[PDB]
């Protein structure tokens, strides 16, 4: 096997995942079969006591595990299902080899951070990379191992350890790193001073760097460059720099344009690694220029309403789902963020100022998208939101929440039966919209179209198959009595689980985009694989949807 | 003529009620076994003539590579079972590039070890870079189809598609050849041909030269037409696809070779003792 | 020490009664299957580590040959049967020349595809000569058996016959190694030898350097006392006869890997999965 480590800087937040997921998506590129571990040095165990209002959105997987967020970066460039254990933490490894204290496993030897958890690290690890996360069942031939933190803190220092010992129980040979560094301008000139101090930092825990890649304001001076390889053991030609570019995608084309690939491929040895990866490596190629094609070669403008969206780390899946979807449609994408809650009739006399600003982004939006919040704070904006493209032909995608505010809306306006509500309102009972089913569902599971709904917009896009498969995180559904209330009245439910008891899609007859989803589909978006009821929120608001069911946007012919 | 047919039909009809042959047909995709319906029916054709029961092992080419032994490794012994087992080889004149790499491996196979062997078509430019990767050394050459090595391409383009009934003559001194002896002494053949892609002519006398003596060449004898690996009981290919003029009275003879080498009696089918009327 | 050695009889007997394992053996004269004996035992005490039932081909070295396909030809057909069918080769340290030049093809056989392999004395002889004979070209090489080639000669005298137990000591930087990791990092190793030849150090650098790596050496580091082809799931040869080592409770661990290699397990033989005892 081979190994990259990602790691380093002088500051949290310089840019590590970009440059891990994209050096991975570059692995890719030569045919080989890829895989992703984020280190956490932080001691939570998992993202499912952390709330949404720090650290951000609880990323979920196919085995439901609620991860840290940064793993969906991997699942979208790389293209791979991960699992519980590739999210290792602080708090995961303690835990593992204090319960292997208690079992008694280390013989009535005393345990210690050295050698005994950093063997743990190490095996931990080793045991990950050979999951098969990939399009077929044989193991990685590269694993991408991001460090968070920063090298030199009293939190990240049992992964320097463990990851010095690796470079040992893994060959030379086998193993490189990739450290970034900060490169500041102050009084207009790049200073290198910060990389040195944090490349002693880092050869002093004894790992030394193959690359140096900077977060630099500026494109990097031939003399910085210079200035940076005299003080690392990197030649000049292996000091990379992720400068500005026109998005986050062209990332993985500027690191094989700095030659970044044709160094790895020597200090890996990557010749001692079937036709099938090496055509599915020019594929990957082709598909990539393609997406960039799509980005060179109109607005399309989307308003998301939710609770605290000035918290936008907290919708992050749901705009890398429009982002690769907007690219399909060969569209540029302009989210407007609206709280929900300054939509309210109530707002007016509290904060008017923001209240009109939260209305003309509404009304200005080519469609509008409901993204799954969390709790009931912004439900009567998003309500309103929900009747606005009810009503007038706006496109619409509701998600989770979303489709429970769908179904609310259609209820309080097409029904009359203006007191109901979802049953978060408790002691209401009567007028409860829906139902409790705690199984919380979690995790990848099937949904099966209605046999009848050839009309379907959304079953278009899934192209004509038979079931989909997709993550949820629900704990209420929409009341089953109520169902055939709203069949009959149009909001039909094309998509229902495995015993056709449970509400999992709905569209509005008759309407030219008006979705929801009872999961989250921005958990399964991919870069060349766009999450199909994002695609068509996108392609409605751009008026192409009809174009791209009949296929005239597919990549290649 | 209507009395000699049905002699004939007695002829191949008591040639089936009066011992098997094994054979080997290695190429892409041999699952869809229509692909190959031609080339069965030649085989079964001379088998005829031979007396013979015909057995065809199918081997997809792809299951003999080196890599499918970690990939698949119980399709893989199937398939080179099939290869050790057989009495010949065929190389059948596939579609496109995929089954090459244990196509290779399979003309090695009977290069080495004296296994009778037809090429045809694509088999003629295997049986190329098969004796051009082993006897020449010469380990990075390769089809034409993987242009931009340029310097190592086994072939060369020859668009003019070459297609329908063309000529193919003998060259002058190659009195020693058992395909030209089972033509019956014929100054030249005609034969169909449906390629893109000839062996490059720069190379052919070091071919010539190291025993892969090409018997048959075109009207311009630029050409390569058919080769014969020199002193081997029987190693043949032919840029032609022979099996589109194989008859059941008549059977096409770069087939019947194959066979009546295969049933170790290819003197004695060339001698006569096999022909359906005194 | 006595109820110890109850548990561990109970362990190696549930570890029979607790899926096969194919293993070609490829040598001189295997009819005689007693002049193997050490080497079959060798075998079933590693077998029963793995839990997996032991088969053993025996396979004639010479029914391999390119001129058995004419002088014997189903012999040949059943032999390379066996080799393709296996999921590991073995080349036990055969005795006299004869057999050597089907054990080359056996030995290119496990090179080519990743074939699990053990070379014993004469087997790392012809691990050598066979990566010689293929991958740095030199067809002409051959065992210093072959005196009056002088140039070619793949190996020298040293008559000291060496003889008995000899330590062996691992080259100070192959911690990749897969045989070095089932040795239990331990230093060095202690074993038995018969031998009158070695590999002529004059070409052991252009054997290391392409990546016939010698991972142990004797103490004066001029002897080829174990190799390893490097990046491959597991190709072992030693000049040694580990099967005169091999205990019931404790197997040999050249053999161990043979068989954990075959079954596919190699990793979690290393890792301590089939350990006896808690
Ligand atoms: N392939 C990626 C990588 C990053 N991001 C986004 O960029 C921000 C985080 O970037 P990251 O690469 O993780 O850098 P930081 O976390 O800021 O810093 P670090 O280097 O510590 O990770 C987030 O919006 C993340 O979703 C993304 O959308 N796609
Ligand atoms: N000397 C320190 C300081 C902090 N930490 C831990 O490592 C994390 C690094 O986060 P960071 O971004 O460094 O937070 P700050 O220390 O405030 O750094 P910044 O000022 O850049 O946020 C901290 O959250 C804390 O968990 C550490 O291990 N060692």
């Keep these: 096997?081979?190994?990259?480590?990602?790691?380093?800087?002088?500051?949290?937040?310089?840019?590590?995942?970009?440059?891990?997921?994209?050096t991975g998506m570059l692995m890719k590129t030569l045919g080989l079969k890829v895989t992703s571990i984020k280190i956490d040095p932080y001691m939570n165990i998992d993202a499912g006591t952390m709330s949404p209002l720090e650290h951000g959105e609880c990323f979920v997987l196919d085995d439901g595990g609620?991860?840290?967020?940064?793993?969906?970066?991997?699942?979208?460039?790389?293209?791979?299902?991960?699992?519980?254990?590739?999210?290792?933490?602080?708090?995961?490894?303690?835990?593992?080899?204090?319960?292997?204290?208690?079992?008694?496993?280390?013989?009535?030897?005393?345990?210690?951070?050295?050698?005994?958890?950093?063997?743990?690290?190490?095996?931990?690890?080793?045991?990950?990379?050979?999951?098969?996360?990939?399009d077929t069942g044989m193991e990685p031939d590269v694993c991408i191992i991001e460090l968070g933190g920063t090298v030199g803190d009293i939190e990240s220092a049992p992964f320097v350890e463990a990851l010095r010992q690796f470079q040992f129980k893994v060959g030379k040979e086998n193993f490189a790193l990739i450290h970034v560094s900060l490169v500041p301008v102050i009084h207009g000139e790049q200073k290198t001073k910060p990389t040195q101090a944090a490349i002693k930092g880092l050869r002093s825990l004894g790992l030394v760097p193959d690359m140096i890649a900077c977060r630099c304001s500026?494109?990097?001076?031939?003399?910085?460059?210079?200035?940076?390889?005299?003080?690392?053991?990197?030649?000049?030609?292996?000091?990379?720099?992720?400068?500005?570019?026109?998005?986050?995608?062209?990332?993985?084309?500027?690191?094989?344009?700095?030659?970044?690939?044709?160094?790895?491929?020597?200090?890996?040895?990557?010749?001692?690694?079937?036709?099938?990866?090496?055509?599915?490596?020019?594929?990957?190629?082709?598909?990539?220029?393609?997406?960039?094609?799509?980005?060179?070669?109109?607005?399309?403008?989307?308003?998301?309403?939710?609770?605290?969206?000035?918290?936008?780390?907290?919708?992050?899946?749901?705009?890398?789902?429009?982002?690769?979807?907007?690219?399909?449609?060969?569209?540029?994408?302009?989210?407007?963020?609206?709280?929900?809650?300054?939509?309210?009739?109530?707002?007016?006399?509290?904060?008017?100022?923001?209240?009109?600003?939260?209305?003309?982004?509404?009304?200005?939006?080519?469609?509008?998208?409901?993204?799954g919040g969390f709790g009931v704070r912004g439900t009567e904006g998003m309500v309103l939101a929900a009747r606005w493209a009810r009503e007038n032909h706006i496109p619409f995608l509701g998600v989770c929440l979303?489709?429970?505010?769908?179904?609310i809306e259609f209820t309080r306006s097409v029904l009359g039966r203006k007191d109901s509500h979802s049953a978060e309102f408790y002691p209401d009972i009567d007028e409860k919209n829906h139902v409790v089913v705690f199984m919380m569902r979690?995790?990848?599971?099937?949904?099966?179209?209605?046999?009848?709904?050839?009309?379907?917009?959304?079953?278009?896009?899934?192209?004509?198959?038979?079931?989909?498969?997709?993550?949820?995180?629900?704990?209420?559904?929409?009341?089953?009595?109520?169902?055939?209330?709203?069949?009959?009245?149009?909001?039909?439910?094309?998509?229902?689980?495995?015993?056709?008891?449970?509400?999992?899609?709905?569209?509005?007859?008759?309407?030219?985009?008006?979705?929801?989803?009872?999961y989250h589909p921005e958990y399964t978006s991919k870069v060349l694989d766009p999450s199909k009821p994002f695609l068509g929120l996108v392609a409605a608001s751009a008026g192409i949807l009809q174009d791209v069911i009949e296929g005239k946007y597919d990549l290649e012919a």
């Design 218 to 371: 500026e494109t990097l001076d031939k003399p910085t460059i210079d200035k940076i390889a005299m003080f690392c053991h990197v030649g000049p030609e292996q000091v990379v720099n992720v400068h500005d570019v026109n998005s986050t995608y062209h990332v993985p084309l500027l690191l094989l344009e700095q030659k970044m690939i044709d160094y790895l491929h020597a200090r890996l040895k990557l010749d001692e690694i079937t036709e099938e990866e090496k055509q599915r490596g020019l594929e990957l190629l082709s598909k990539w220029k393609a997406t960039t094609g799509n980005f060179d070669e109109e607005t399309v403008k989307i308003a998301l309403v939710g609770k605290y969206t000035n918290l936008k780390d907290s919708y992050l899946s749901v705009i890398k789902a429009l982002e690769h979807s907007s690219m399909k449609c060969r569209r540029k994408l302009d989210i407007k963020w609206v709280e929900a809650t300054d939509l309210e009739p109530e707002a007016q006399e509290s904060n008017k100022t923001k209240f009109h600003e939260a209305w003309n982004m509404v009304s200005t939006a080519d469609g509008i998208l409901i993204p």
């Design 66 to 134: 609620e991860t840290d967020l940064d793993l969906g970066n991997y699942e979208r460039y790389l293209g791979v299902t991960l699992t519980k254990d590739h999210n290792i933490t602080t708090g995961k490894i303690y835990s593992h080899v204090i319960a292997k204290e208690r079992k008694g496993d280390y013989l009535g030897k005393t345990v210690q951070i050295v050698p005994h958890l950093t063997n743990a690290i190490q095996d931990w690890i080793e045991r990950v990379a050979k999951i098969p996360v990939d």
């Design 1 to 22: 096997m081979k190994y990259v480590v990602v790691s380093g800087g002088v500051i949290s937040g310089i840019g590590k995942g970009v440059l891990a997921s994209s």
């Design 442 to 518: 979690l995790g990848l599971r099937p949904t099966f179209f209605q046999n009848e709904t050839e009309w379907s917009q959304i079953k278009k896009l899934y192209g004509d198959v038979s079931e989909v498969h997709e993550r949820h995180r629900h704990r209420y559904e929409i009341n089953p009595k109520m169902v055939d209330e709203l069949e009959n009245n149009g909001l039909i439910f094309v998509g229902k689980d495995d015993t056709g008891k449970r509400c999992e899609i709905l569209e509005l007859k008759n309407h030219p985009y008006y979705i929801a989803t009872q």
């Design 402 to 407: 979303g489709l429970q505010i769908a179904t």
